Design a protein around this ligand. Structure first.
Ligand SMILES: [Ca+2]
Ligand SMILES: [Ca+2]
Ligand SMILES: [Mg+2]
Ligand SMILES: [Mg+2]
Lengths: 548, 548
């Protein structure tokens, strides 16, 4: 099995994890100095948010140089020391590859906006890197992702006197993927980090590569053909590396980003479809949407693995739910207007769940039990909160809370001088929520998370097994089996806030003896018709194995 | 029923609870400012720790005066305005009436140590307030309560050329209740206080205030007789006022401190026998000794009400258990030698349980669901810790952690300047553990404790019902009914740290449905032989109702 299929992933931002030089901004020596924490947590793969030169208008997703380290973060040598130190402990590291767009400061765009003809009359080879219209009327009816900021995906450049296309901020013009030259520029950018030993990339915003009149300009077959060539290049020149897709689409579209056995595409795709449903079910005490949306997801190819997640550095996206589900999620998880942004909710995991550790634990166990490799949002493992006074999605990117000291140990700069201010409020601030506290606390959420990954790590069925929902006769009780190489696990979760009963249909397993995976406390052998009664307490989770 | 049977009791110490003036010592004006917090928590009755003037060689239980206010805590003025406010919100206030002994610095000993006759020739009336002994051989077959500090109960005084008796410290000379001017002086002690508004007293060290040869000098019939007088004096002169007794003995010998219907002693008595087997059964994951010690209590009189508790201002006493049980307890709950004292363990409740909230919540449920009126020890509702760098049992008596400011909000004096230092450590300290934080946090242990009080108060069969244990087929699962007034509670509690299956014996309720007390989700209907199957997750509590 390929290494990503057994990996626990951890998403962090360099600028926001550990400040190492007192200026208030995270950097590569600060991260390096913290690799022991990441390793002893149970993390296998670090996914780093963009680290390139950038004005930071979309926090570095507006790349101005695909081949440097951003001056806030240190030097290209600092990055080389970090990559070497992470590999010595057995961590993989992936980067973030912004294929769809660059920053409007990228030298390419500064050359492109000078018109099709550079002022001495010869053709301007860069003008064509980007996507231009005389009046910005093409691709109408296509939607706007940043609904609270942009009013058109086209914008007029003052010096070219034409419009350019951008699916995101106006400072992030789309790259033109019908220009073969653009394809090689990025294959070459991927080559520069892969040559240095990077283990692969998260690949950003992949559904939006190619645009076509008369289409939504999402999931276009031309976009898949490009992504196929990225994999064909990685497959030939860098066997073993990982390509992981960001694609918030509906199930029948997401699964396509794996390609096929004959035409592979991505190795991994975030399971965006399940993520909203975890939160809906919890609030409805009805888990059917989890089962319904899961059942819409086709089998993926042999090399493929889902990456399961609860929250990331973005808002909780309601882009891919129905109008009614969206409206239901806003009412349940966004009671204040300031809580929402671009068809999303911009809150951290713990505040989404009313800080109820039981609910945090339940979803964290659903995160570890579905088919796939899990990704942890940095700081979620100590129960970090949010700062919704910050703009856009910055509120869920406050600094990591290392201890109760100056700026939660993130920096020796004062809180007001850090890149984003470290949280200080009585519930979620660093005096109460910090890593030092929770390493010394015997029953902290940090120790739980570690123990629970330790638990997962000891049963490969969690990483490689099939999946089979079990009828429970109570919508509050979600039940499934995970089967692999002999072992059968049976996973039972109550999404209600009080005690619940069910009749598990274990008819296929009559005469088997369930045991807890933690300590093998025995449960009644399944007998008779196999209709098996269970009771559960509020948010309980049963991790069992079925012995034959 | 009488108000005590239906009340929530809160134990606190004025010195430790809230400083009003700035000198690092909790005073009555300050306690009076925190009366709303106790009201909103759902507490009915404050049991205070001795507020009387003292040298404090045993935090107020070496009493030098019985009829005034220790100047640390403020004035008698202040006490008035305090008892006026506690009553102006619906709070009963009881007091600690220290009986078997006084402080060696109490006028009646100061005078008594001058000998059996004054130098002028007139018999010293006071010399026989206390027990004396020419050659200290009278009363050998006796144990010393404080075995870490006292070698014997006799202490040779100098100025009276004589030994004198103390069951506790040499600075607490025992009182002589073969003297009737003594008895009068402690009926007169009371009269002082109940006449101002007080509602009763906890009675200190009842089983030891009468001593006689050839015996064990505890629980002697001569001793119970005086107590009957106190009750008699109180029923006669102050009707509807409480008497609660510290009676750490084996069960039957304790029940005797209630009186009988004919001649009655104490209304209320701490259920010392059960409090240790809770801790034992959690570690053993085997509740059998919880039943056994409740199954060895005799029924109690009508007016009689057990007082239930988990922890208090002392250590966790292990005095009344078998020598096998006392070794296991130490092995389980005192890994470090300096955590023991006087055949006991001097740790707070949250550290005793590894700061594991699930375990904390569990014992609290069983607290509030066993037959009695419960007493909560201050700070346990937020999870406070213990400081073993304090002497005696003062490690579980640190300042109330109110917020995250100067000294936890307990005082404006810095931590070095407080009567005892607040706790500052990364786990239990007041930057992480305080009231302000827990007021603001939807799922805090504070709000959980007051939610569970609200839930106890909607179901009077907790205070007033009887009690019947139910078979479960698994010693880890403790279940019992509490019936009263045509309502039946079914209380099911799992003491194991992993999931447990049980077979509950519900034969008497065939055709009834258990429904959760919280949220009213019904469980399946008891059918057949009433062998009702259950599964529980680690430390679950099911609070159910059985409908006709
Ligand atoms: Ca594009
Ligand atoms: Ca005595
Ligand atoms: Mg820095
Ligand atoms: Mg004071």
């Amino acid at each position: 099995p390929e290494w990503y299929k057994s990996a626990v992933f951890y998403e962090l931002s360099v600028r926001t994890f550990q400040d190492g030089n007192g200026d208030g901004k995270g950097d590569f020596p600060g991260l390096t100095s913290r690799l022991d924490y990441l390793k002893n947590l149970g993390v296998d793969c670090l996914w780093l948010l963009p680290w390139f030169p950038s004005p930071l208008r979309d926090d570095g997703y507006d790349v101005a140089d695909y081949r440097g380290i951003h001056p806030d973060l240190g030097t290209l040598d600092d990055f080389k020391v970090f990559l070497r130190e992470a590999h010595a402990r057995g961590l993989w590291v992936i980067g973030d590859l912004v294929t769809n767009h660059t920053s409007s400061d990228h030298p390419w765009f500064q050359a492109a906006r000078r018109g099709p003809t550079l002022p001495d009359g010869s053709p301007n080879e860069y003008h064509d890197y980007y996507v231009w219209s005389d009046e910005g009327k093409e691709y109408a009816d296509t939607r706007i992702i940043f609904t609270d900021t942009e009013v058109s995906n086209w914008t007029l450049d003052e010096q070219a006197g034409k419009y350019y296309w951008h699916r995101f901020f106006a400072s992030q013009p789309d790259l033109n993927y019908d220009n073969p030259k653009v394809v090689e520029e990025l294959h070459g950018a991927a080559r520069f980090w892969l040559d240095l030993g990077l283990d692969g990339f998260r690949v950003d915003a992949v559904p939006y590569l190619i645009e076509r009149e008369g289409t939504s300009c999402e999931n276009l077959p031309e976009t898949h053909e490009i992504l196929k060539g990225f994999r064909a290049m990685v497959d030939r020149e860098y066997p073993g590396r990982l390509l992981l897709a960001e694609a918030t689409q509906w199930p029948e579209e997401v699964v396509e980003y794996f390609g096929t056995e004959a035409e592979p595409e991505f190795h991994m795709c975030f399971n965006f479809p399940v993520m909203p449903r975890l939160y809906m079910s919890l609030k409805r005490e009805d888990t059917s949407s989890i089962r319904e949306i899961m059942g819409r997801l086709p089998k993926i190819p042999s090399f493929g693995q889902w990456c399961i997640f609860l929250r990331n550095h973005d808002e909780l996206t309601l882009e891919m739910v129905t109008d009614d589900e969206r409206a239901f999620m806003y009412a349940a998880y966004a009671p204040d207007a300031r809580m929402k942004i671009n068809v999303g909710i911009r809150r951290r995991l713990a505040p989404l769940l009313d800080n109820d550790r039981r609910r945090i634990e339940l979803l964290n166990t659903v995160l570890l039990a579905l088919p796939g490799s899990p990704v942890l949002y940095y700081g979620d493992e100590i129960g970090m909160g949010d700062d919704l006074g910050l703009p856009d999605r910055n509120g869920v990117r406050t600094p990591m809370q290392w201890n109760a000291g100056t700026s939660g140990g993130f920096s020796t700069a004062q809180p007001s001088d850090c890149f984003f201010p470290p949280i200080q409020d009585p519930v979620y601030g660093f005096g109460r929520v910090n890593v030092q506290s929770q390493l010394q606390d015997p029953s902290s959420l940090l120790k739980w998370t570690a123990r629970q990954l330790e638990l997962r790590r000891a049963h490969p069925a969690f990483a490689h097994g099939d999946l089979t929902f079990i009828e429970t006769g109570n919508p509050a009780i979600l039940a499934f089996t995970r089967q692999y190489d002999g072992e059968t696990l049976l996973i039972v979760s109550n999404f209600a806030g009080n005690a619940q009963a069910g009749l598990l249909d274990l008819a296929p397993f009559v005469g088997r003896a369930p045991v807890t995976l933690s300590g093998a406390s025995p449960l009644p052998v399944v007998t008779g018709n196999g209709q098996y009664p269970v009771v559960m307490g509020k948010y309980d989770y049963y991790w069992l194995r079925l012995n034959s």
